[PDB]
């Protein structure tokens, strides 16, 4: 209930929205039902529209006008935004030059440059090209601040979780939005687009911008536009906001627009009609900067123009029918489009079985245009698991492709030319930003980044403390002119011990055997300063990571590499090596096929045994420095450490070995030489972060020997290619991945053929952020470089995406 018959009077845009039952008069009351009864004719005027012309110049104030082209208009705050270029002989923002902002120029009584983000939904990144003719004063922005060619959204790059991501700095998994559609089991309720359950509070979860703002004192516009709202009034609103008293202004807004994503999915990303959202768009952007002229603000305020996702084509032809896989298609509920998710119909149906339904709709035919996963095993890059409201069975969505329970969902629940959801690493889904102000560098490109990092930087913007989030604070610092946030990188928390020779031989009863009893004084002298870590400089270029959190580890030297030996998982966590461009790859000799050696240096009850995987018939081993890239014959040796060894899955081997022996080669050739750093992971709880020991569901069979959820490698070199590796005097290149560690390829459709067909295509598919991997394994790495912390943070959040160029 609401008593609609209060008034509007004085209260039109209201800052605090009012309790039930008395009406409101706030930017949301239509889309809740409870506006007084004179909110459209107090509040949203339309009189004589939104332009000055020549004839209103000096009018009498009429009160019943949109807005105003009197006298005393700028000291109301309510000018039309045209007014000084109509009446006063001023020039429209974007017909000025640009100038730089050193300094922030504001009236008196701003205590900070107040904050505007421009949200545009559906604005793909290639718009800024291929639109560029019809966006002028978007384009001004964009070469006058500072931008990126494009801005990678989050997954699924569906509206909601998207601006959501970018108010809270979180992984949809974190705030809870998982997409457009949800059902939470333990509410038993379903949120959806239309209806009023999306506007209970308990779905929304982290801490918004706005909220961090209040809490710390800095007063928010509100930051949402009931639909009927036109955005010219939407600008007068914020323009208007902006001439309160210092006390009652606040100092961040938001402004959201509906296009061009409205448009967008009627005529498809590129279709004709969609020039002319663009062009509104930019008149709008036109608007709200001569807006700001008028009041002296345009350059005092940041001004923040960014997307939420992009836009693919997309037909009714191109779905797949899931009533094509199963038989049993009316036992499951399918949340469908751009991305599947499936659980059963009833919970009452104890015939239900995810296992026959994924192996189903596995490689069942020979174009397939979606993949089924459960969604522990989906790339770990899209942090799509750690939620109840994310339902177990997932499909990866082919991009220009939908998937549907039945064909009668599609005709009867063509209509659409354009859609998105898809993997967040996909071309037409990237989407933009651009700054702009006195806190903004001036006429900057900065490499791709991720939305999850806007955040920290809108925090900074505007001197607040972030609430705990998934940026990287410091990653975005290249952005800005002032205002940077000092990060010091997190303190070790465990010292490493350093093994000298202190076993036997004999004292070992693993059960392994080594055919190593062939064999100075010239290279002893040798092998004891390699144990020493005589050559380490070579194959730790970066410093050792530091371990962040407590427990029991050795580091060990070796000729061709070093690792951290973790005395608790009875494995590296880490293992580093260089290989420049010259290095030879040769094979296993054939006597050393099943060769494992006792190391000497660290306990057998701090030891894997050999016999464990002799009794576990699923599990096999590998070895994280491989043997293929041994510098002698003698070095060799070192390889076949039960130290190096770690559990592999007779199907994972296929996927490892060819990477050791082909790919790493294939890099140093192409890079100039890879520093490598590869290890174990593992994450059976599928949060993103390492597991406790106590947390580890699967060892190998009668051990103590953990089984790795996944295997990590990073894989960095010169930026300067004309560099070696190993003699780099600048920035950085990196790329990682993180493999899932699977006893069966199903993943991938081609895996009967050569490992030459499929491995690097799985390799790409699970590409990494240096910093995924720091998450999942309490590492920090880059510690010694001669680079700038903010620089190693910018590396740390790179993510080779593999797609070709954006445009094209
Ligand atoms: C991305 O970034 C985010 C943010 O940094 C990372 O996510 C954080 O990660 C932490 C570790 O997993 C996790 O810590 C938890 O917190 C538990 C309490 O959590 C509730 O309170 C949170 C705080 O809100 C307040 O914030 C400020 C202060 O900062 C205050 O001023 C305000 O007043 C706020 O109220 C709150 O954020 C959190 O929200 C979640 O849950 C809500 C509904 O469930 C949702 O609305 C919301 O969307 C959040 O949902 C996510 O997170 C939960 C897990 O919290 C997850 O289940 C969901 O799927 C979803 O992903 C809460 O309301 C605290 O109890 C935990 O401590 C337990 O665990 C350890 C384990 O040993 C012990 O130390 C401890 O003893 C305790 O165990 C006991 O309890 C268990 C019972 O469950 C039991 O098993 C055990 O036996 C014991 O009895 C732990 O510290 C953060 O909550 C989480 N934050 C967010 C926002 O998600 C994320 O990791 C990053 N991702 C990556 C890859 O890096
Ligand atoms: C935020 C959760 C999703 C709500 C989507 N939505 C709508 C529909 C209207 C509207 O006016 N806005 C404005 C914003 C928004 C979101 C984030 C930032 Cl930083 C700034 C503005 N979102 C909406
Ligand atoms: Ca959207
Ligand atoms: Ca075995
Ligand atoms: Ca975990
Ligand atoms: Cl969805
Ligand atoms: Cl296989
Ligand atoms: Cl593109
Ligand atoms: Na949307
Ligand atoms: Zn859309």
């Not at 939620?387 to 220009?400: A, G, P, Q, S, W």
Request: net charge neutral; proline share 7%.
């Amino acid at each position: 209930w609401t008593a609609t018959s209060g008034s509007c009077k004085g209260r039109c845009f209201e800052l605090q929205e009012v309790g039930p039952p008395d009406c409101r008069c706030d930017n949301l009351c239509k889309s809740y039902s409870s506006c007084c009864h004179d909110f459209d004719e107090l509040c949203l005027k339309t009189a004589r529209g939104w332009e000055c012309t020549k004839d209103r110049c000096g009018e009498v104030r009429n009160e019943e006008n949109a807005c105003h082209c009197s006298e005393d208009c700028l000291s109301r705050g309510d000018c039309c935004t045209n007014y000084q270029v109509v009446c006063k002989g001023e020039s429209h923002w974007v017909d000025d030059d640009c100038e730089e902002i050193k300094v922030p120029e504001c009236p008196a009584g701003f205590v900070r440059p107040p904050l505007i983000i421009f949200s545009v939904d559906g604005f793909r990144a290639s718009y800024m090209k291929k639109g560029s003719k019809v966006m002028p004063n978007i384009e001004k922005l964009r070469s006058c601040g500072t931008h990126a060619p494009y801005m990678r959204p989050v997954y699924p790059t569906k509206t909601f979780p998207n601006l959501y991501t970018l108010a809270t700095g979180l992984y949809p998994e974190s705030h809870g939005i998982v997409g457009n559609s949800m059902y939470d089991p333990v509410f038993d309720a379903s949120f959806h687009l239309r209806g009023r359950e999306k506007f209970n509070h308990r779905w929304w979860g982290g801490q918004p911008l706005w909220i961090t703002a209040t809490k710390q004192g800095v007063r928010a516009g509100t930051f949402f536009w009931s639909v009927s709202i036109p955005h010219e009034r939407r600008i007068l609103t914020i323009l208007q906001w902006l001439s309160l008293p210092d006390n009652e202004r606040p100092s961040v807004y938001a402004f959201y627009s509906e296009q061009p994503d409205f448009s967008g999915h009627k005529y498809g990303p590129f279709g004709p009609e969609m020039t002319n959202p663009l062009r509104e768009i930019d008149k709008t952007v036109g608007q709200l900067m001569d807006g700001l002229k008028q009041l002296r603000l345009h350059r005092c305020v940041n001004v923040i123009f960014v997307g939420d996702h992009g836009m693919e084509d997309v037909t009714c032809d191109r779905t797949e029918f899931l009533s094509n896989y199963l038989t049993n298609v009316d036992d499951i509920t399918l949340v469908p489009g751009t991305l599947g998710r499936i659980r059963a119909k009833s919970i009452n149906n104890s015939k239900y079985d995810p296992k026959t339904i994924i192996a189903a709709l596995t490689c069942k035919k020979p174009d397939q245009h979606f993949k089924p996963y459960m969604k522990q095993h989906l790339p770990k890059r899209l942090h799509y698991a750690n939620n109840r409201r994310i339902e177990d069975i997932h499909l990866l969505v082919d991009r220009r492709w939908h998937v549907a329970r039945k064909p009668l969902d599609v005709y009867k629940k063509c209509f659409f030319q354009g859609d998105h959801g898809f993997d967040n690493k996909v071309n037409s889904m990237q989407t933009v930003f651009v700054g702009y102000g006195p806190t903004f560098k001036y006429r900057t490109k900065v490499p791709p980044f991720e939305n999850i990092e806007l955040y920290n930087v809108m925090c900074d913007l505007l001197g607040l403390k972030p609430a705990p989030n998934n940026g990287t604070h410091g990653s975005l610092n290249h952005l800005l002119r002032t205002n940077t946030f000092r990060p010091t990188m997190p303190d070790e928390v465990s010292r490493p011990n350093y093994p000298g020779i202190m076993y036997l031989q004999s004292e070992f009863d693993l059960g392994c055997t080594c055919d190593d009893k062939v064999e100075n004084k010239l290279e002893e002298l040798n092998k004891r300063l390699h144990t020493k870590g005589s050559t380490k400089e070579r194959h730790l270029l970066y410093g050792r990571p530091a371990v962040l959190y407590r427990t029991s580890y050795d580091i060990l030297y070796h000729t061709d590499f070093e690792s951290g030996y973790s005395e608790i998982f009875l494995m590296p966590l880490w293992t580093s090596y260089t290989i420049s461009k010259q290095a030879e790859v040769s094979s296993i000799p054939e006597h050393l096929t099943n060769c494992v050696r006792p190391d000497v240096r660290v306990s057998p009850g701090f030891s894997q045994n050999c016999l464990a995987y002799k009794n576990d018939k699923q599990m096999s081993y590998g070895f994280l420095f491989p043997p293929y890239l041994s510098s002698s014959p003698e070095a060799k040796y070192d390889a076949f450490l039960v130290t190096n060894m770690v559990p592999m899955y007779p199907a994972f081997k296929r996927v490892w070995a060819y990477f050791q022996r082909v790919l790493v080669k294939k890099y140093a050739s192409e890079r100039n030489g890879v520093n490598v750093i590869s290890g174990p992971i593992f994450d059976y709880n599928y949060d993103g972060l390492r597991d406790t020991e106590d947390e580890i569901k699967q060892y190998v069979e009668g051990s103590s020997i953990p089984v790795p959820t996944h295997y990590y490698s990073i894989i960095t070199s010169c930026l300067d290619f004309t560099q070696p590796a190993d003699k780099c005097d600048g920035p950085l290149s990196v790329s990682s991945f993180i493999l899932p560690h699977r006893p069966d390829n199903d993943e991938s459709c081609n895996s009967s053929e050569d490992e030459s067909k499929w491995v690097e295509e799985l390799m790409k598919m699970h590409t990494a952020r240096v910093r995924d991997i720091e998450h999942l394994t309490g590492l920090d790495f880059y510690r010694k470089t001669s680079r700038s912390y903010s620089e190693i943070l910018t590396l740390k959040t790179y993510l080779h995406t593999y797609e070709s160029e954006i445009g094209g």
